[PDB]
Symmetry: C6
Subunit: 94 residues, 6 copies
């Protein structure tokens, strides 16, 4: 598992057998932290919709034996969108 992917173009450039259906950036990356050595990645991604957005938080932790623990959570946020017009993205009023 590559712990530092930030967009679908960087994913296709680093995973040789990646298969993507639909718009791979439907959930745009808001922020992410990872340590390849400590084996973890945490990210927030946002899908803009009519009148609000869908916010996803993701955690993945690699174990010493090579296995993984995973968690995901999701919520709807009214009248906000992720702004992707800057280098540092944020959620704000539509």
């Amino acid at each position: 598992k590559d712990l530092g992917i930030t967009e679908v173009r960087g994913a296709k450039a680093n995973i040789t057998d990646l298969v993507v259906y639909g718009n791979g950036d439907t959930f745009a990356l808001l922020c992410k932290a990872s340590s390849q050595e400590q084996g973890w990645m945490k990210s927030t991604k946002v899908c803009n919709v009519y009148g609000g957005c869908i916010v996803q938080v993701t955690t993945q932790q690699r174990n010493p034996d090579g296995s993984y623990a995973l968690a995901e959570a999701l919520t709807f946020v009214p009248n906000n969108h992720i702004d992707t017009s800057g280098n540092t993205r944020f959620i704000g009023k539509i």
Copy 2:
């Protein structure tokens, strides 16, 4: 692909919005959407295979008012009903 697959009801009740996967790295991630009256139900799914062949799994779900997955083109999107 699955010889003994059994489906109850509409197996596409949650229609696929997007998906990424890698068979070698052993993970898949998808978003699926069920259109209902006045809004839609959005499901996110992650599955990761481990080196010993076992799996880690996660799921999350939310309601989105006044949106439907629009399947009228090749690229689906969630938008105003």
Copy 3:
């Protein structure tokens, strides 16, 4: 092993000899399900109709090669919809 293909209580009672049910075990009614007993997974959506809307549950279970399981659950309230079980195919729609 876990039966991954149950669709209602009557079927569970007929296939699980020691099943114990408290209350109405069809409170969360099956909307859709897919499963493979040999590949070892099931995914289902269930709906509990309530006053003014319904509660929707999505459920995933995956069997591992060593016979253990991975599991996930998620839940949301849906206003002004109910599962309709009056026809061959069930659906969520306006109350």
Copy 4:
């Protein structure tokens, strides 16, 4: 793990070292299915609050090696309460 507990009185009568803080029936059992042999239990519990209720779904699956997999989920339901005045409980209008 006892897979068939239905109320806090039955839990105290079967678990010798059980410790309960607060009202142990804050989340009242709505429905439950379990198989001791297949090793699983699934339950819905409901906490009545002002103007609505909190609904919890719980799944626990025992593995061949004696370990467990667990999952939980929670949502708020407006203008409904669990009715406990009958033997078979239901969620309905407050």
Copy 5:
């Protein structure tokens, strides 16, 4: 009981509502509540210890409008603000 415990902020931001546990059977289940303006945040927690000493964990969270955990008596409850 925990010698190296480190707490940041108010360690009781989520106040305990109820809890059940068994040290021998190896599980604990709790509900905790954070009072906010106009409502409260309700967290449910489960932890199960395995025979090999490892753990399974689960968490869930929801917002409840116009309720607070009432801590004015020995038995706490969620009720109208």
Copy 6:
């Protein structure tokens, strides 16, 4: 092993030599945290302020005796509240 006591990005960068951060890594600001590095667990609440409310995340991680981990996450929207970080103790309150 996982550092279970991080409270902000500056502390993570100073204690995790290969940390990589995309975007503003304090987007979810720490509200409260408890951890024991020796017992192997951490529990935290983080808040992302947005227009008209905030997003609240609760996070749990537990280390197992074999060095592996169990994890859980949950998330909800809270209307008309923000985390206030202007004082010694942070709190969620009216915007």
